[PDB]
């Protein structure tokens, strides 16, 4: 039986003819040709005699998956399926160029992985570093070639085995695409680990068009050893994260974990849900990462996300090295709904919607951050969380614009006294920002806008309360150490009638030539005796800076009326003309709106 021998051999399929649907005009093929149109791990998961090996906890699938990728790479590419209904364990390190990255599998250009089954790490990796899928082809990323056109997708799962880090200095990753152009991860669930990142895109600005979409990241920090975690790190331009789910349950994640970092221009983070993390996203130009795409991170978008976090939602930064200066500009943060989860005050990093963070070494005088728009977001922190702010402004800021947000937390603008002394320019807080009332009555000894800065210039703060909080010391306070110039600071009178202090300038900074200010105050006045039109003058002489003032109080009297409006005099008194129906010296205490140049 010669024909029998061929048919039963591995070339058997190549001798059975086939023509699509018996169509006379279709290609006369062999069964093997049609089967060759697809490829799976089963086609490489075999022993040296070619007998298929069943996957399992006792089998290391690494070499077989690598053989599949290497082969498909050699044919110009394709898509390898990792079959559903099986768990495929990885139990050794890869070799060659990915060894320097603690790599397991080496990705190759044009070779996609359709992961329908589960990929699981074996206990070999317990307490060890690892990067599961690596797209670099050299231990030195600077000498690595590119990875192009590599997509990982499916309904499958990458499971990191639950193993803790062995040492804080170790690094662990799921997918490092490397110097990556047109690469993506879609649909995959990454779970059950203690890792540094789940996915990294690009390398120091090298790369383009890399995306993470519709992925889940679940419980990826689990130990006190883990130094730091950011689930997706975007280090190439024209790249981003969309429609993903991020969840952590460990206490440690609330102190160290961030969902996304955006580190190059034209990058985005949109439409995603975050729970249990410390931080939402870093948006930062690191000078050390400026090689591939320049020293500017611009066109940065964080939009339409949903988050419960314990520290800061968006952290802005930029820094310098010996020879390069990083710049961050043209950022939009819009449409996000964010809360600080239930926690004790000071039990996690300081709660904030926006943080202007110092560099990794703690320097606050290196940053060049400007042209940032924060608009149409909602932020909430529970009433007990003292450490919650719309913005913690902890390093030099060259501009940030807030319009039409709803911020319901302890502070609006904050920086800790006796820490950094930021230089602030072009901070714009529009009157359309609504200040919520959750923290009313909690603010004893506190200033709602606590302006603990070296200096403030070209800034606008338009304070509008929407309910009373008589516990606060002031709506806005500038310590004497903070210079203030070419700025507009206003406090709307609504809900302020009973406040002893509204705006406080501890160095009398509101007297500056180009400071435009208005706020309520209580003023004692006394009139002359004259019947008829009669002047009223303030008893105090603290108003040399006031350009006009007007009454916010009713007049309980019949026989006279104080002035509706006032100007000042050289000695610092207010003066206006009221009316004595009957003569007599009058004395009244009136609530006035004090105005300077507005």
């Amino acid at each position: 039986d010669q024909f029998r021998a061929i048919i039963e051999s591995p070339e058997g399929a190549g001798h059975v003819g086939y023509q699509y649907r018996r169509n006379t005009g279709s290609t006369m093929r062999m069964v093997s040709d049609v089967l060759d149109e697809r490829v799976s791990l089963w086609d490489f998961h075999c022993d040296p005699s070619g007998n298929v090996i069943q996957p399992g906890p006792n089998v290391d699938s690494r070499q077989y998956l690598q053989a599949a990728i290497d082969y498909v790479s050699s044919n110009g590419g394709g898509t390898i399926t990792i079959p559903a209904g099986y768990t495929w364990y990885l139990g050794s390190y890869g070799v060659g160029g990915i060894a320097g990255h603690s790599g397991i599998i080496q990705l190759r250009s044009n070779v996609n992985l359709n992961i329908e089954g589960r990929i699981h790490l074996s206990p070999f990796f317990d307490l060890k570093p690892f990067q599961v899928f690596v797209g670099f082809d050299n231990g030195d990323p600077a000498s690595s070639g590119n990875l192009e056109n590599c997509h990982i997708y499916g309904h499958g799962v990458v499971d990191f085995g639950g193993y803790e880090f062995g040492a804080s200095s170790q690094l662990r990753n799921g997918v490092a695409f490397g110097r990556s152009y047109n690469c993506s991860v879609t649909g995959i669930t990454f779970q059950n680990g203690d890792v540094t990142w789940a996915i990294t895109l690009g390398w120091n600005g090298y790369g383009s068009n890399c995306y993470v979409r519709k992925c889940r990241f679940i419980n990826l920090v689990n130990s006190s050893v883990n130094a730091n975690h950011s689930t997706v790190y975007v280090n190439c331009p024209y790249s981003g994260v969309e429609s993903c789910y991020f969840s952590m349950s460990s206490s440690f994640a609330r102190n160290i974990a961030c969902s996304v970092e955006l580190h190059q221009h034209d990058t985005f983070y949109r439409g995603s849900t975050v729970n249990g993390y410390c931080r939402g996203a870093y948006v930062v130009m690191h000078a050390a990462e400026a090689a591939g795409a320049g020293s500017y991170a611009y066109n940065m978008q964080v939009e339409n996300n949903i988050a419960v976090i314990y520290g800061q939602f968006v952290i802005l930064g930029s820094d310098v090295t010996a020879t390069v200066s990083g710049h961050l500009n043209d950022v939009i943060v819009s449409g996000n709904i964010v809360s600080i989860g239930e926690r004790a005050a000071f039990s996690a990093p300081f709660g904030a919607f926006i943080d202007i963070g110092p560099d990794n070494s703690g320097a606050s005088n290196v940053q060049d951050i400007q042209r940032v728009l924060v608009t149409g977001n909602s932020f909430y922190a529970p009433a007990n969380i003292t450490d919650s702010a719309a913005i913690t402004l902890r390093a030099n800021l060259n501009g940030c614009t807030f319009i039409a947000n709803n911020f319901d937390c302890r502070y609006m603008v904050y920086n800790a006294p006796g820490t950094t002394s930021p230089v602030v320019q072009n901070l714009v807080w529009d009157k359309s920002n609504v200040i919520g009332g959750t923290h009313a009555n909690q603010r004893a000894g506190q200033n709602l806008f606590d302006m603990q800065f070296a200096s403030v210039v070209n800034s606008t703060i338009e304070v509008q309360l929407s309910c009373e909080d008589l516990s606060m010391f002031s709506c806005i306070l500038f310590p004497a150490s903070c210079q203030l110039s070419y700025s507009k600071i206003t406090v709307d009178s609504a809900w302020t009638k009973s406040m002893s202090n509204t705006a406080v300038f501890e160095g009398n900074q509101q007297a500056g030539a180009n400071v435009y200010v208005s706020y309520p105050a209580t003023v004692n006045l006394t009139s002359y005796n004259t019947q008829g039109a009669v002047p009223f003058f303030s008893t105090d002489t603290n108003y040399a800076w006031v350009t006009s003032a007007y009454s916010l109080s009713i007049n309980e009297n019949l026989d006279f009326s104080p002035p509706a409006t006032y100007t000042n005099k050289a000695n610092g008194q207010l003066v206006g003309v009221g009316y004595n129906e009957i003569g007599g010296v009058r004395s009244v205490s009136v609530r006035l709106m004090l105005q300077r140049q507005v």
Copy 2:
């Protein structure tokens, strides 16, 4: 011919050898192994002798599809293809655990359906209830196990046969995922029915990570019998609807159909287009649904949708049962563009962008709704639609914030007089909301903000017109039955010069100690005779509450000038100091901005 017999048998493929692309290092397989990597309905759509059966209107495909799902379930899962180019009819009910749900097909964990062809309901189902795909495994959902990792996707179609409901009490559904974790529907067209829902996600808070993406829902209500319709009902957290299309053509849909309901925390509805529906989305915490995820619906997002509807866009609610109280908070509604379609006034449910709706029994004193941000939306209703409002505020409200919207409809804030008397707290209407002019000249007898409430506290209404409408009775009216306290109510003077009434307080509520108000009014004044500085006093004594007023009128006179600014007196007169170049009693009628504590 022994070998011939084996090759022609069903085990024939298992005797033909194959090795991928003749690669010496690839697995030596059999053709059957490679074919076994995929699975379709054809592999189960056969008679008892194993002969394939062709689908068609005369064939019930249910048992075969169920057999396929049951089998793949037993192997740890996979994806069953429902082939393109065929219509597969379902013509009987399923059995076992899904019978209590009028179920047709029972879904099982890890078994995906790739629907490329059409699934059609046979006339067996005419006038009957049905739920086409059911993920519960018990008639009692409380005793049901979970459905996990079940995805339905493809370019295919579920067609409900056009059959009307037989009775209003019947229920019909397309996909009920059940107690559903990591389940989704993507790409599918659901059409041609009279159903209650197309898709339901979760059960009373049990479930997670369920999504509906890139689906179409077309003509899914067609009869007067249909009691109610919501196309997608999201009843588990961390779930949502994205990039879907919803269309109805029936008149009945304009009165009963909603596109989406969001009923648990961290849920979303984004980027979708709606036409022909009554309602856009319910966003509600039902106490009766609080078992799986708690009694709070928070982190609720409705964003970037496009809608033509006939009733209300977003309906907020919360309610209670004997032992549980539902709460709704931390909601964002942003970036939506919505219109009321062409219709006669009062011909469908009352038109609204936001509705604060009573509970199912009509109770308006059970709701706990707060921390809602409505920002950056546009709403339009044609000029004839009397029943159109930015917000219909019909039940107790604990807070809602409007910033930077464009509302072009009959009313801004409305509630019907002599219906409910809501208790209102923390209603914030920022001055950045633009009020359109489509309904100018239509408002005879109407108040633009009709404050028909029991009480209003800690609220802000900053009215800014952008064109004249002298037909309206007032910009804002508070009936004497509505208490008003700790609130700010302002009417900007632009386009108001000719209005007889701007703000109306029928119980003189603007006199409250912590009410901050400003609005224009016309006032008659008379001066004393004195040459020189001379007082002017109002003829009326209705101004005991005014803290200051200033002129909005020019002075046509040469020989005198009235005061630019006024205060009040104990008897309720305004008083200010003007100037008589020549003596004489003066009498003038002036438009003033009346101010209280602002």
Copy 3:
């Protein structure tokens, strides 16, 4: 060997039995049946004897791909794979109905293309027109049938060969879906050409539910011959573009290329990144395109995009033909972050966030554009780019509303003097729009809001600076040729103290009966001699229109004080009552806020 003959024949696979996974309950099939479940180009890419032909630059694959589409069409449809690891060249025109469209491949209903490999145009097409994939079935689109349920998707590539246009009048396209219902392109990279469009959806309003998602468009203009380019043209309703990437590198693209055009109702452009283009999106109702969906483009959404462009971001338009009038309304532009790329002033079309453009023939008196909301966007242009505006308002406008944007460019509102004279209604510029300072000191001879119109009615401009720019001639200027009525124009005083001109009305238009205005000015006053309450009067008589004015200056004097507030007199003087502690004629120069009816 009779059995051998059958097995080796093209019917061989139809004689080898198969039963899925040896399941006794599965269908007893033949291998051919299972292989027949899929279909690829390999099944048709053969010679007349049925021998497979290898693709390559020397092989025209067109006829084979067409045969595949024609065949699958005949079976009710399916998905044809274009295999990965191969480049498939097209080298001739198609025949029949697509010839009138210079068509290569004719698409057919229900036949999807899964493009995993590359499709490349051969040099046959150099200097020639072409439309690669055409869904029309007639040379005359008006006589064409529909294309339904056609999806093109995959990780593959359409490469236009780099060939330049041969003549400016030629047209080139990638995918013309035609009269297209439920058609889409997903994941595909279109690159390396000189084309008119990459994708067109619909035809003159005929079509529905067509989408372009997750596609890349790279370097699709390369010559001075190319007349015009818009990458995706949306010409059917309920359709749009989402999550796409658009990049150009040619200088010509900066002058002629637009990323998207939206031309019918309920269409969108979202979540996309654009670099190197002239324009972002046209949003236009062309009367010539009103056949299929009506003469109104409404529910138009441009949201959450990222762009670097050289001309205009969003261009609005509508026009008329002999018998049809186009209307554009109900548009939202929100959440976009856009910059003008580095370029010399006037070196590309005039930079703008919004352009109200004239029609194709240059007519500016045909447009009906209204109910547009522009909110929560950021725009930046470098300081040297004189030709940069938030809005270039160059044709009649019936309404546009700006709320809560950040605009950092040369002009806010602009139209060139001595060009068109638009009639403007319902232009609303809310005070929540933040005006950036990049162009401070660059504005010599320029007006920030340059109101070069025939007339302005029912409009609001609330100017708020956030830093000083004393170079500008004025904040807002109306030439005498521009009528102004029923409008509100205000200039906030912050950063204006040193400006000689704030608001300028060259025809004294601010005196209109229903003009509501406020702005700062410097005024010289002189008092009478009288000790005590004493009048101050302006020296100039230019204030007959002023209803009130108040001091923006401090009083450096001890012996007297000028009035805090003023009204006017019939002769055009201001007058107020100040106070002389000691008698004497006083003379002062004061900065006042002039107010009319506000």
